[PDB]
Amino acid sequence: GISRDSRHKRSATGAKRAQFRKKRKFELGRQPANTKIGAKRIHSVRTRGGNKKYRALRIETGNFSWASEGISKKTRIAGVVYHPSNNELVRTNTLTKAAIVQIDATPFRQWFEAHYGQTLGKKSKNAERKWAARAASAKIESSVESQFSAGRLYACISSRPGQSGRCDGYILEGEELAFYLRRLTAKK
């Protein structure tokens, strides 16, 4: 086991703590998950007090917002693009928190132009009732839909990959497009 307390680890003034209390169980951390892609190979540990935590490697499907309200459309993940912490997980395809993922972006403009059907920009009695009631709404932004031409768009993660066994992020918004489209783009 690997410990987590500071009974080792030279103190503030530089004095060594000659260590007592060889390591116990209640401070135990353990080896990371360092997740992957590849369709739902998850195990399950049991731990403190009687509790579940889901070890997650090779996840396949998340859910991602507008994020005007939080629609959470069912969405498969595709790959790994860019990360703040290190260049560890770009060329190993690990998706962590605060990461950048391309997902598929195909059911969204499907939804955005079947529930609206605008249709931008590369009938029945109810679309005259309920779609026509929601007129003057579909104006969104250019650089959030200028990537809705080739087929795919970016997203970030804001759920815990390896502990909770899940992956529930959101596609970026507004200025946070314009930040990460300055981060990774200064390459060629």
């Binding site: 005007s68 912490s85 605060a98 969104i140 932004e141 946070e176």
Partner: peptide, 19 residues
């Protein structure tokens, strides 16, 4: 002050970009 390898913003905070 936005400086570093991540973007820095307060959690659970959302102004609507359409507004």
């Amino acid at each position: 002050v936005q400086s570093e390898r991540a973007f820095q913003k307060q959690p659970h905070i959302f102004n609507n970009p359409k507004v």
